Design goal:
Two copies of one chain form a homodimer. Chain A is α/β, with parallel strands linked by helices. Chain A is 40% helix and 24% strand. Chains A and B meet through strand 7, strand 8, strand 9, strand 10 and helix 7 of A and strand 7, strand 8, strand 9, strand 10 and helix 7 of B. Bound molecules: chloride ion (2 copies) and magnesium ion (2 copies). Chains A, B: Belongs to the IspD/TarI cytidylyltransferase family. IspD subfamily.
Amino acid sequence: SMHPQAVAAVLPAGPTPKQFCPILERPLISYTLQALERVCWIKDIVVAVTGENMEVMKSIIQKYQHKRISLVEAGVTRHRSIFNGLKALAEDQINSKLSKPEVVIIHDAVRPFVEEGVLLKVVTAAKEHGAAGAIRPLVSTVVSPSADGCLDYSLERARHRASEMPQAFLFDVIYEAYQQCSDYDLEFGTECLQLALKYCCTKAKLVEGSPDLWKVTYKRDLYAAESIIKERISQEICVVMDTEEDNKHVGHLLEEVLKSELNHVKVTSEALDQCYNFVCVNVTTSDFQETQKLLSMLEESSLCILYPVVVVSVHFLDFKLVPPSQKMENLMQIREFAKEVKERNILLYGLLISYPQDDQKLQESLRQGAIIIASLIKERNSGLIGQLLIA
Amino acid sequence: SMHPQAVAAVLPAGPTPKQFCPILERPLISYTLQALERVCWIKDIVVAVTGENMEVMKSIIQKYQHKRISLVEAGVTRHRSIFNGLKALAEDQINSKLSKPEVVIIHDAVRPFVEEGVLLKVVTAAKEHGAAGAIRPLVSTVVSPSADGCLDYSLERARHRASEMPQAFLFDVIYEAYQQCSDYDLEFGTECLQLALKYCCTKAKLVEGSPDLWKVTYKRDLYAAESIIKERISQEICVVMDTEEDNKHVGHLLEEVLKSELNHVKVTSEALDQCYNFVCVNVTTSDFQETQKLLSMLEESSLCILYPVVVVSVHFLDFKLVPPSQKMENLMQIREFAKEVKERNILLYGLLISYPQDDQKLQESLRQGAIIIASLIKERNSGLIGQLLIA
Ligand SMILES: [Cl-]
Ligand SMILES: [Cl-]
Ligand SMILES: [Mg+2]
Ligand SMILES: [Mg+2]
């Protein structure tokens, strides 16, 4: 209850920039906006986009239900885009629609893994100093080429750092800096903290940042970001079951084995909240009554808007190696359901567990079940939807 | 037939460095060595490792069958490790075991995506200039902190570049540079090209490099590298079949649909060479005679040493929705085979295609088959081995 007061954010969102490149069919900028919106004390988030993209952005705001977002037109350069964002926040006009912050954050649309910690640190350092920025060590040596493309000099790696986002400023300082800024610097400047230093004699505080702060620039960064996203949504599973005592027991049985086999995963069970993996468990039918309920409940929801939701429909059934033909015929309705719910961003898979078995055989099947489920969750791959797997 | 003559390479292999971190259970350094060994004209590859790791490295050389590798002891710093590598190549002693190169390449063990192109360019520039290095543009602004951790100054992004590997030198130049180098510079220097400039007045040629040249430093770089590796081994598939005319036709049928559905994939068919994906096709039995032959042929091979090999055993069978119980019982031997060959780094999956069907139903099953196969290839995930999938 001690959150910074009067804070807003500005994102310039103007190889080619990757802010609209999809990850799991969702544009990268949407993940960044989500990460910023989760920080309750950032009152307004001002995003600069170009005219050609203004409609894509608005559609993105609607589709993913982003809150506290005000759009402004980007300039041709990054400093111009940021200035327009600050203008919109200045509350110094008849036209102004937004409270003037004390502290403003600058972030980039292609840096989706920002969290409340580093933000708090840069906001706090900026109150005390006027300006602040996240830094990282250099991995590569920096060099200066001559006109003919030969080594002129090398810089001492230990005396330099890479400037990263987020940055934060006392609003009046940075706004005043932009108002004094030469048009040359607006065109060719890359670094807001250098503006504050040159035009307001404000020496920014450099805060140490995590490896997560990097900017998505290349294809390989998109790969890395996809993986981090998929890992983070793999850490929670909800096992769902009927009130029937048979179903509750196998459901809880599976819950327990998922907990013990998948270390560092939060597993819960609900009868029949930011969870994207569901394990629906059934003994008492050769059908999908429980799974159908769960799907209809998710087809409505906005869980499916934000990330692909994985649903594993699990059936405990009596059989030696293969279940009887007629029961297997019923289970194959999974294919049809999977095809339908794929359209709503749900990935539906089936898993058969032989029940009952001898103790050790059943233990092994439960472990295999857990591994299979973890695998389907990890990969989140649409290619295997509708399959009936066996533990 | 115009390859550079008298070339050798030196790799200093001494968060914590990631050269022994596994990707697909194979250490990162092994992928780099493979990439360098593929360049035929690099006569010797000298790798510096620390004493504690000398045995791991030797084991790695044996396990993955690396050629042309000579090991030397790493120093405590990077310049010391490189000097020892050059010493071993100098051929200026009774103890010398290696031809003296005209040009030597320096590379890093944690940069596995180096290819003949950039190598040729830096070797060629180094003949003409004495020294040469790959460069990249800067993504982040570089700054200098003051003692109290505040912004001192920012560097102009457009006048600087990030120095990357590979680098190459006329041997005598760089060897002479190391022989004149102060112990301070051996301790604190990060940049071989700066050595050549300071101690031999050699201005290195800066060659433009690809985004692939980056160094694996963080967990997120390991993710990216894994993805790139898996993508590159996904571009070739071998469909394997009996001489039986029935099997040849369904095998070739599937080959053709894989070609058309998987654009930019090289697909070939062999009867029953750097391919890690096999599709074994069978109509004429409810058994795995053809697949067993293929597995035994791979259990011997060194394909499985370098990358996990994916094998999809495909059965075309008559059935409406579910195949008859007794035939399904036979197909479940797949589970047992998969468990066994997993130990030899082979990932075995099963796929059932209903045959015959009406034209359009069969077309659809073939397409789904292709998507399933592509998915299993893409992910290369051990969790789903032994499953019988249905197209
Ligand atoms: Cl402006
Ligand atoms: Cl030495
Ligand atoms: Mg600018
Ligand atoms: Mg050194």
